[PDB]
RNA sequence: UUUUUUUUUU
């Protein structure tokens, strides 16, 4: 199918809610409550979308604009105004359908249609409800059919789990789908997931096949998404609308971006304390922080040592795939509305979700794919705010930054070097109540995430590997010491005739 | 000795 560039334009003619109401486009009742919201403006990406998704035009549309910068509303209003468009044919039907790659980010983007309702009640009409997993599946089936709502988001799969039972109910005039963060929905694991979806909302359609119109969203993704994309989108156009340049980097250019590198991989634990005890020194308690970390037993472990070091002086929040569906949403909520704390998270937070006024983000090590490098920092310097970001890695984890430059186009201007002190090791390591075999867990988690992510960052597995493993001699006090597993085990890890193996495990079985 | 998420509260 035909890809439309659309470019960033520097000198095109400013668009605003009065322009779209006075030419037609935007219904007075949507006006309205975005009216209400007092935004300084529209932003770029809002400016350039609304109108070419409402287009009577046979076309798909994609759309890539930075962090932080308004690509939900960017979808929501259009769709609003599809509804008010259409709002006599098919009342009680989904006629809309987002989904999103975590539940989180899906109930996020949920709470801001209510956002939209609440600012003009005459819109409560829409009704929207939330397909998500972790939550009562005949509760929200009961609301499916109490509300009858015109617009559905989702995960996908609790989305498929869903339509496999009523489709026909509900879903057989739908007129859009919108993939947010639609770049991890086409990667493998989410990718098929979403063919599925894309393939029973287009059979059951009732007017056809290609009905539907596909709205993508990311801050990251460039003409190959089109590729991946080929079986979802089923117009015979498709309209790129690019609000960054095609050489121009994809992170966010206000956030003030470092890199310190320590010797060993361990060493980043120590660093990362350090930067945080500064800052909440520095800033007299006024920091509000998100810490990222590779895998779920690492992020637990690391709050853990978090709390011993700063419960007293600030909130330090847990948010990982492994905590209740319940606490997950109660945190999201409190996060959002805190002045200051620190929340510590695998990539479940990566991406999309919004707490404002968040001064840092910190990465212990890398994230689980390039792209969420950006994803991760733009969690900061949201909405015209400011903001830092420090990514704390290990020698051995150099190529990856050397990748974020020759893949992405990001040099990271500040970088120092940092060696703990024998007081700071003392003081983190004592703290510590994991039992050997929990540590064990622990780091050999980082063993099985660093693994998978070797040739994507150009590791040199004979290095990364040993000096992760050591990680577990490093919180044990004893550099000589090697992780205890069984022959069977190294079987299946596939390391038992290596060298490398050898580096990083002792056979006592 | 589940590597980030993602139905299985249908
Ligand atoms: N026109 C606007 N002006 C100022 N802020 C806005 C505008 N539209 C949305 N926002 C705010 O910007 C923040 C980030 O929006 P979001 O859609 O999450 O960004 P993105 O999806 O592009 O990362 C939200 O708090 C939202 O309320
Ligand atoms: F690009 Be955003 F932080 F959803
Ligand atoms: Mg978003």
């Known amino acids: 199918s035909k890809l439309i560039h659309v470019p960033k334009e520097d000198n095109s003619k400013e668009v605003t809610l009065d322009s779209l109401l006075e030419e037609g486009v935007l219904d007075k009742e949507i006006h309205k409550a975005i009216t209400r919201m007092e935004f300084p403006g529209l932003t770029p ?118 339509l496999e039972k009523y489709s026909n109910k509900f879903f057989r005039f739908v007129d859009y789908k919108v993939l947010d963060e639609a770049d991890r929905l086409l990667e493998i694991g989410f990718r098929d997931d979403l063919e599925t979806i894309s393939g029973i909302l287009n059979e059951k359609n009732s007017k056809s096949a290609d009905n539907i119109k596909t709205l993508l969203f990311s801050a990251t993704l460039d003409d190959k998404v089109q590729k991946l994309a080929n079986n979802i989108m089923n117009k015979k156009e498709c309209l790129f609308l690019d609000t960054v340049d095609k050489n121009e980097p994809e992170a966010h250019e206000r956030i003030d971006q470092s890199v310190v590198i320590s010797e060993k991989f361990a060493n980043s634990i120590f660093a990362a304390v350090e930067h945080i005890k500064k800052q909440i020194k520095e800033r007299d308690s006024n920091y509000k922080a998100i810490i990222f970390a590779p895998t779920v037993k690492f992020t637990s472990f690391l709050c853990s040592i978090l709390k011993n070091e700063f419960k007293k002086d600030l909130p330090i929040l847990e948010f990982h795939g492994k905590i209740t569906q319940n606490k997950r949403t109660s945190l999201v909520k409190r996060f959002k509305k805190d002045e200051s704390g620190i929340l510590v998270c695998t990539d479940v937070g990566a991406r999309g979700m919004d707490f404002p006024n968040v001064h840092e983000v910190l990465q212990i090590g890398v994230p689980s794919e390039l792209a969420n490098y950006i994803h991760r920092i733009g969690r900061t310097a949201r909405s015209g705010k400011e903001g830092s970001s420090v990514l704390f890695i290990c020698k051995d984890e150099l190529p990856f930054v050397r990748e974020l430059e020759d893949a992405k186009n990001i040099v990271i201007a500040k970088q120092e070097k940092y060696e703990p002190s024998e007081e700071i090791k003392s003081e983190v390591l004592e703290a510590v109540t994991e039992e050997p075999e929990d540590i064990s867990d622990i780091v050999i988690s980082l063993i099985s995430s660093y693994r998978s992510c070797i040739k994507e960052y150009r590791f040199s597995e004979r290095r990364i590997l040993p000096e992760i493993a050591s990680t577990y001699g490093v919180l044990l006090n004893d550099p000589q010491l090697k992780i205890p597993v069984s022959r069977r085990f190294l079987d299946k890890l596939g390391l038992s005739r290596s060298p490398i193996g050898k580096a990083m495990f002792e056979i006592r079985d």
């Open 45 to 162: 990406v809002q400016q350039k979308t609304i109108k070419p998704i409402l287009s009577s035009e046979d076309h798909d549309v994609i759309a890539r604009a930075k962090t932080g910068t308004g690509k939900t509303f960017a979808f929501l209003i259009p769709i609003f105004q599809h509804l008010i468009n259409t709002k006599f044919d098919s009342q009680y039907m989904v006629k809309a359908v987002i989904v999103a790659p975590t539940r989180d980010l899906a109930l996020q983007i949920e709470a801001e249609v209510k956002k939209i309702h609440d600012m003009n009640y005459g819109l409560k009409k829409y009704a929207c409800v939330s397909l998500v997993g972790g939550t009562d599946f005949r509760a929200a089936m009961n609301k499916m059919n109490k509300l009858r709502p015109n617009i559905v988001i989702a995960t996908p799969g609790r989305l498929i789990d869903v």
